[PDB]
Design a protein around this ligand. Sequence first.
Ligand SMILES: O=[Se](=O)([O-])[O-]
Ligand SMILES: [Ca+2]
Ligand SMILES: [Ca+2]
Ligand SMILES: [Ca+2]
Ligand SMILES: [Ca+2]
Length: 279
Amino acid sequence: AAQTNAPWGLARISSTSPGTSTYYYDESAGQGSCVYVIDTGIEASHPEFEGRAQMVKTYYYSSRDGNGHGTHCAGTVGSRTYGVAKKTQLFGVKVLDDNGSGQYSTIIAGMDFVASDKNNRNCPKGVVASLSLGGGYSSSVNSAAARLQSSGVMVAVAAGNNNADARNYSPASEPSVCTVGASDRYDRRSSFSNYGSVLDIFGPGTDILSTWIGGSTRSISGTSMATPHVAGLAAYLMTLGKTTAASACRYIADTANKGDLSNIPFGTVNLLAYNNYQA
Ligand SMILES: O=[Se](=O)([O-])[O-]
Ligand SMILES: [Ca+2]
Ligand SMILES: [Ca+2]
Ligand SMILES: [Ca+2]
Ligand SMILES: [Ca+2]
């Protein structure tokens, strides 16, 4: 399948070269998979989600996304226009308040929640969790992410936006999950992207168009935007039967575009998420 005039990041994930604008992907499109977006919520009523999104948990007075961040990330996972995996099921877990903030205790509970809640959902092709969030190093937060992964969920987490080594941030620094850095449309490391040995992969993260609250769209930047590209890619590849939740991060690294990013510090992987889709 071909989506013309796609957001650059979608075109990038199905290309061996920067500078194209069509996204190519197998029409299965992540059908039968599920992606949990653990964030500020998801505006499930957005036409872009086509009834495939729903809120399943909140720790606050509403399950509504009063911020936009979670809706944007969910859009990059699975919206019809802005998403990687255009037929996946999206589940929102609101661990961040409408200011985009959340206590680590709440974030941990949300991860635990997903590990169990997947047993209440129909996801025959597998389960992914996307965590576009983080803060300073916490062994408890890392352990929660490790448990979620161990439970059979492909966990993708943002590296962080500190232009620093991700070793000092969580859940970025948990080795067993998929830690995602950000690139731009010219295949440069995004100016803000964290780096380091713990990164597994880069995805598009600068100037990413997606859904926003109030039935709208906007372009924003962050490792938060790169992460859902990788989460959606995992769901897509799992639906194709090419990999599993336990092995998807490694598979994505194996099959990535290699050596094509600039300003990658010595000792950080030079790997850009790629679907290797061949019609
Ligand atoms: O190229 Se675009 O319109 O910023 O995705
Ligand atoms: Ca409500
Ligand atoms: Ca450093
Ligand atoms: Ca890892
Ligand atoms: Ca290893």
